[PDB]
């Protein structure tokens, strides 16, 4: 019962870290239409157990660096 | 027992060899405080003759509408060539909130509490017909139950 | 020091105090934490001039909130009933 977010992975070139393209379904305040405003983050990737195009679940932890504030807990649907 | 009213009087101008020929048009409305209501449009060289023709054509070609107590059964719209009208019922006390020919036709139609609005051109000739169409094409609980095969209490 | 005091409001010459718990650093009529009861010194009869919350005031006095002289006088008056 810990607040977590699930999203794709876009880049793995950085050492021991990845990025997550969190996607959501937000309703427009004015026109009342549902859109997809994505959100990018920097997630710690100890042991580099991830890959590009993979679905991951993350967790909010202490800031590891200037842009790092999230860490992963597992990996699911390791599509190639 | 009728209450005839005059909405607008205009002056048209023909053109002939001699010059201009001027005629007068009159728009009138007739009502009785109940569902009976009608409109008339007359043209004549004299204002009294035009209004008399308008009254004669308005006393005939009348229409029947339905009111709950003194208001509209439900909000309703009316559309004509270049005039759009919206009119909804209200509570007893606020009166008639409308402008131009609308407040002159509803008053003789007997509707005492309504909120109305005009969108587009506000020409009296078109707005009177739009209001008449809007009052005609509105339904009552008994009328809608007669076609839906249910009861007024079941419809609510 | 977190304290319980009287913030003044109302029109001129007809004040109306509210017993609130706030830090001593903050202003009188500015920032506070909780509002506990009011006080109308010019109130007439058959009209309550004090509606303090004794349970809530004790909840803060047990944590360290001090009490002003006027607040203590009002507490004594309301306890005298």
């Amino acid at each position: 019962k810990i607040r977590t977010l699930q999203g794709r992975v876009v880049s793995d070139k950085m050492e021991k870290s990845i990025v997550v393209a969190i996607e959501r379904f937000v309703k427009h305040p004015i026109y009342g239409k549902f859109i997809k405003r994505t959100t990018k983050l920097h997630v710690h990737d100890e042991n580099n157990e991830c890959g590009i195009g993979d679905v991951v679940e993350i967790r909010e932890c202490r800031p590891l660096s200037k842009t790092k504030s999230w860490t992963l807990v597992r990996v699911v649907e390791k599509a190639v | 027992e009728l209450q005839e009213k005059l909405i607008a009087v205009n002056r048209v101008s023909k053109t002939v060899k001699g010059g201009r020929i001027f005629s007068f048009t009159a728009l009138t409305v007739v009502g009785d405080g109940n569902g009976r209501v009608g409109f008339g449009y007359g043209k004549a060289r004299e204002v009294p003759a035009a209004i008399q023709k308008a009254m004669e054509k308005a006393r005939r070609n009348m229409i029947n509408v339905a009111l709950n107590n003194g208001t509209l059964q439900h909000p309703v719209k009316g559309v004509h060539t270049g005039s759009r009208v919206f009119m909804q019922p209200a509570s007893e006390g606020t009166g008639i909130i409308a402008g131009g020919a609308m407040r002159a036709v509803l008053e003789v139609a007997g509707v005492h509490n309504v909120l109305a609005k005009a969108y587009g051109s506000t020409n009296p000739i078109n707005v009177v017909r739009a209001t008449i169409d809007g009052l005609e094409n509105m339904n009552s609980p008994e009328m809608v139950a007669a076609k839906r095969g249910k009861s007024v209490e079941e419809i609510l | 020091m977190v304290t319980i005091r009287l913030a003044r409001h109302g029109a001129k010459k007809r004040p109306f105090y509210q017993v609130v718990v706030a830090d001593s650093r903050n202003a009188r009529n500015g920032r506070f934490i909780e509002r506990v009861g009011f006080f109308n010194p010019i109130a007439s009869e058959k009209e309550e001039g004090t509606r303090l919350d004794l349970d809530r005031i004790a909840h803060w006095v047990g944590q360290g909130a001090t009490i002003s002289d006027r607040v203590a006088a009002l507490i004594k008056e309301v306890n005298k009933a």
Partner: protein, 129 residues
């Protein structure tokens, strides 16, 4: 391309009413059957049936009272380009109660008058009056 079969069904019904057609035929759907059930229960149509096993055709029998039609106004509130979701506290009332707002709720498809009693909202499919 076809992207709104419910709206296609509503337009077929409206065109049949306009042309004084007794019966309307269309492809069948699990939601179209539910909508026709609500329409039949509310009396806007006489009956509905489905024929076939792999390519089911749904047939509706329209109702005409005193020579004219019954369904004077029929709209598609929610559309694929703009989905409409309203709670129970702000459910619409078509014609001040003389119309029906078909609502898909967590229990099924029902009118606004029946959904408010159950105390649940959902999607507003169409307005009929």
């Amino acid at each position: 391309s076809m992207q709104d079969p419910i709206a296609d069904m509503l337009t077929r019904i409206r065109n049949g009413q306009a042309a004084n057609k007794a019966a309307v035929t269309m492809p069948s759907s699990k939601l179209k059957v539910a909508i026709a059930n609500v329409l039949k229960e509310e009396g806007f149509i006489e009956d509905f049936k489905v024929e076939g096993d792999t390519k089911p055709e749904l047939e509706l029998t329209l109702k005409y009272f005193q020579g004219k039609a019954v369904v004077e106004s029929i709209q598609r509130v929610s559309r694929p380009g703009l989905r409409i979701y309203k709670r129970k506290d702000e459910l619409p009332k078509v014609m001040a109660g003389l119309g029906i707002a078909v609502v898909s709720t967590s229990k099924g498809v029902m009118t606004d008058r029946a959904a408010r009693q159950a105390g649940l909202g959902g999607e507003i499919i169409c307005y009929v009056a």
